[PDB]
């Protein structure tokens, strides 16, 4: 648990983008990659779009689920999620980081974006306190993480449990 | 024999499915309350991967772009390998007293330890008598107690990726409602059965 | 020779005013032998092994142990006030539990850290500069107190490169 | 105090966080020399006629028994403490840059010290490669760039840059003949947050 080290996990997740090379003095690396020609998309992780965007080479483009209206819905939904809601890729709070920290040089509405995310964020947070004001008699078999995402989940893990086995004992 | 395994085998295993083939081994280890199993194929996997790639580079030694990525890349699967055996390493300085009890029970194949760690644990528990050489050692004692590491009810959060229903296996509690997706919390002691079936996960 | 912790030896001192129910001898750290019924405050290490059948000395609580207080506070579980008189109160009983022969306190014990489990609520944060709620504290509720302060502090670090 | 001071043990350490000007070897001396005047009644009564058998000297055998378990944990974290953190700087450094002094060396700390150094050196032997290639772990971590240049820091000393060059005097202006090989050794203990 850190600022960065979910990033050696979340940003190998894959987005898809469009260089503006010829394929280079090395054409295409040995694995997953496709080729390399400018003018058309190509597929990638995300430990070069960081490299690559701010190297001056290319531009960029996200996901579908970077939009207004779809989480302009999913909010209206979450709330009467008495458990859970909409999940896109499950570690979404980590590429909105480091898609508008660099990326808003061509990419549109690019703060509105930011207000409906924090504003998912908080409601769902809010929601995984009362967890805890319910959690009662020790039960330990038995909770919540139906359509839980993990870059929350963090943000309780050293509080709660280290202390909760060796209290909560008794029962 | 069945060859074409994702082994070293007459096959190509990516630099990503060789990422993937121990990084639940490294998250697992991570959130825990103890050791769990041990792996050494990796050593001659990494190094024979990773020394294939860099004379590889070597030959093209002089571009700019391709030495580069091939290099951040290497980078980062040499920092998952240091994280993995960093905190393995500091689990056994701590859990070097009752370890030795399993291992003189059996003993165990590549499953649980591995032999340098072996030679790590022997080498510290006898220095740390021969430091204590010059505390009490004209009167040391005359004549159990000293455990760490033996705790196994600290709460874990697991992921289930199994049949959507209840599918009900070993573990003491009612274990109901696992799912596909989904996880109802529970501890290590009554749950260290699924994960060395690899059924379920942490994170 | 414990769970340990950092509090390593906060563990077995905790002072006690028990009574006396036969006689002893030479009591050393205070006659090789005395009357049946005497105050006396004794620490926890010796008596820790020392059978809870086997009568030298008798049933004993201390005050703010005793059931009247402990009692009307598993009734005042929402605003038991503790201060510096009392600083630790969490695992006590982890030890003390079964002298009673009146079997009252580990329920006490577990609806007061219960109610931690309602509290904390509200701890969640280090909104700002220094110290906030730094004596109403056990000093191993204080841990993961400093333990989730420094989780926010370091995931406000993340909620941007900052 | 009766079992307190380990806490002030460690404050011979107080300052030193980062900003270290050196260390010693405080708080064993009178502190062990207890131990040797307290045996004789831990064990005066050894199955003797003392007493005549009685019940009575069970206070006596828990008193050894609790002095020994704060003795020897007390050292246990004297121990593993001082290990730890320079641990911290033994990761950040290999025996390159040793200690600040390596004058608080508590006298048999030499076994300890050196066998943790023993432990990096089986690190580096199996891992890495299985002949061992000592993998460059936690500094110098430069993207392949120039082999010999220097440039500015922020003041350390201590001085044991042993590695390649005359003198290179490891400091700000540490500006001199400095191979690759030479400085192979800085990433933080107080030098290039600023190049």
């Known amino acids: 648990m850190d600022p960065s080290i979910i990033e050696f996990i979340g940003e190998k997740c894959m987005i898809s983008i469009i260089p503006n090379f010829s394929n280079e003095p090395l054409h295409l690396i040995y694995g997953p990659v496709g080729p390399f020609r400018a003018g058309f998309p190509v597929f990638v992780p995300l430990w070069m779009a960081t490299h690559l965007r701010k190297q001056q080479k290319c531009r960029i483009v996200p996901p579908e689920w970077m939009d207004m209206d779809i989480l302009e819905e999913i909010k209206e939904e979450e709330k009467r999620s008495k458990f859970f809601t909409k999940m896109p890729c499950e570690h979404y709070m980590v590429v909105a980081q480091l898609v508008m920290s660099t990326a808003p040089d061509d990419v549109p509405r690019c703060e509105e974006l930011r207000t409906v995310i924090k504003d998912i964020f908080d409601i769902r947070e809010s929601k995984l306190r009362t967890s805890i004001d319910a959690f009662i008699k020790g039960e330990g078999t038995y909770a919540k993480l139906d359509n839980l995402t993990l870059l929350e989940i963090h943000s309780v893990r050293p509080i709660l449990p280290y202390s909760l086995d060796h209290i909560a004992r008794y029962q | ?203 | 020779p414990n769970y340990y912790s950092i509090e390593d030896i906060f563990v077995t001192q905790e002072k006690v005013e028990c009574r006396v129910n036969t006689k002893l001898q030479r009591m050393g750290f205070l006659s090789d032998d005395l009357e049946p019924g005497r105050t006396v405050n004794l620490p926890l290490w010796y008596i820790k092994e020392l059978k809870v059948n086997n009568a030298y000395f008798t049933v004993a609580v201390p005050d703010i142990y005793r059931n009247v207080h402990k009692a009307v506070c598993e009734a005042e579980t929402t605003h038991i006030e503790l201060g510096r008189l009392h600083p630790y109160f969490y695992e006590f009983g982890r030890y003390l539990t079964p002298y009673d022969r009146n079997h009252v306190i580990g329920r006490i014990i577990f609806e007061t850290l219960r109610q931690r489990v309602r509290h904390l609520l509200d701890i969640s944060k280090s909104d700002g500069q220094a110290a906030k709620a730094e004596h109403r504290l056990d000093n191993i509720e204080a841990k993961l107190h400093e333990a989730g302060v420094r989780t926010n502090s370091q995931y406000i670090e993340w909620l941007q490169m900052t | 105090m009766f079992g307190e001071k380990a806490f002030d043990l460690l404050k011979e350490l107080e300052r030193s966080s980062q900003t270290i000007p050196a260390f010693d070897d405080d708080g064993v001396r009178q502190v062990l020399e207890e131990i040797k005047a307290i045996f004789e009644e831990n064990v005066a009564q050894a199955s003797s006629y003392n007493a005549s058998g009685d019940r009575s000297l069970w206070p006596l055998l828990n008193f050894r028994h609790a002095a020994l378990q704060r003795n020897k944990r007390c050292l246990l974290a004297y121990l593993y403490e001082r290990c730890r953190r320079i641990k911290a700087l033994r990761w950040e450094f290999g025996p390159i840059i040793p200690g600040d002094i390596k004058q608080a060396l508590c006298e048999p700390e030499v076994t300890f010290f050196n066998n943790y150094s023993k432990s990096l050196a089986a690190y580096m032997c199996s891992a890495g490669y299985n002949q061992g290639l000592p993998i460059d772990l936690t500094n110098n971590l430069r993207p392949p760039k120039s082999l010999y240049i220097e440039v500015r820091c922020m003041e350390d000393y201590g001085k044991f840059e042993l590695d390649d060059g005359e003198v290179i005097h490891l400091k700000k202006n540490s500006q001199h003949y400095l191979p690759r090989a030479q400085v192979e050794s800085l990433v933080r203990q107080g030098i290039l947050h600023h190049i």
Not at chain 2, 56 to 76: I, P, Y
Not at chain 2, 119 to 144: C, G, L, R
Request: proline share 4%.
């Open chain 2, 1 to 203: 024999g069945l060859e074409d395994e994702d082994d070293d085998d007459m096959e190509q295993i990516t630099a990503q499915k060789v990422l993937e083939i121990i990084e639940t081994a490294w998250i697992n280890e991570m959130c825990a309350p103890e050791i769990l199993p041990s792996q050494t194929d990796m050593l001659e996997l990494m190094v024979s991967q990773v020394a294939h790639m860099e004379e590889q580079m070597r030959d093209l030694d002089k571009n700019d772009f391709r030495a580069v990525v091939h290099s951040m890349e290497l980078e980062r699967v040499r920092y998952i390998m240091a994280s993995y055996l960093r905190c393995r390493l500091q689990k056994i300085e701590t859990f070097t007293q009752h370890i030795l009890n399993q291992e003189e029970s059996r003993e165990p194949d590549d499953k649980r330890l591995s032999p340098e760690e072996t030679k790590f644990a022997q080498e510290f528990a006898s220095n740390v008598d021969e430091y204590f050489h010059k505390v009490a050692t004209q009167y040391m004692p005359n004549q159990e107690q000293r455990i760490v590491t033996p705790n196994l009810m600290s709460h874990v959060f697991l992921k289930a990726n199994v049949a959507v229903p209840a599918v009900i296996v070993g573990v003491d509690d009612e274990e109901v409602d696992m799912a596909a997706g989904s996880q109802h919390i529970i501890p290590y002691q009554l749950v260290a059965d699924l994960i060395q079936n690899n059924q379920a996960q942490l994170i």
